[PDB]
Amino acid sequence: NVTGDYTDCTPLLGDRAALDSFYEEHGYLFLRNVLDRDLVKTVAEQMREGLVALGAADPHATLEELTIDSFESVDEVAMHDYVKYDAFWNNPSTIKVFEQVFGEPVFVFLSTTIRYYPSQAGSEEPSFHYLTPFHQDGFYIGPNQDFRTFWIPLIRTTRESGGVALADGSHRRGKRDHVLNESFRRFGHPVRGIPPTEVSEDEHLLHSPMEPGDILLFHAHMCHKSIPNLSKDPRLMRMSMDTRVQPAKSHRGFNAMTPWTESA
Ligand SMILES: O=C(O)CNC(=O)C(=O)O
Ligand SMILES: [Fe+3]
């Protein structure tokens, strides 16, 4: 169902008019090699440390060789102890990028979601229920809708290893219908997702390979979903994290102020 690549918006960063115009029309920005790659490597290594320490991964493996039997069998709460995301998001170099995007001082959510998904290529009964269906972060984050989601790869993604796919320009008609879907679950219970019918033909589904150092960010009403990891050439974990950022002056709601483990 993916029809296109993200547009490389990096050349827009030093042109406020063009940057704002693209974001207004499209509801996303794809920025390449703007984050400190050594900082990103450190986060990736921290995630690996967790997966190794918790018995899921091989201590002899490089990041790209890394694999785990199952996302679900890893203690996610313990993983949050390993991955030092707040120190990353709030590093002056990272903040500089966020500030250039918003054009004003920012506040980074105290909640981050960390994702460490093995390839399930070849699996006859794959476990993809922990992924996300089509949704808008604004459906469950608020009350303010001026936050943006910041999504980063910790190791590179491919079209086959997955990531997040975005319905281009789908952020301009408010929140769309999220209905119960038995194939997506959290805590063993079904979750709500936007049926593909509620996404227009013109709202092209974009997903592109990304490299550590890149950022994908998007509007509260941007309709987006997970792309499953079916990598085999080469087989890669999909290792990423996502938080939300907003203007420093905006109201700070429940998710803004509450760490992932607390709300989980
Ligand atoms: O990364 C994924 O699979 C899903 N991510 C999101 O829904 C997000 O970052 O808002
Ligand atoms: Fe989301």
Ligand SMILES: [Mg+2]
């Ligand atoms: Mg609107």
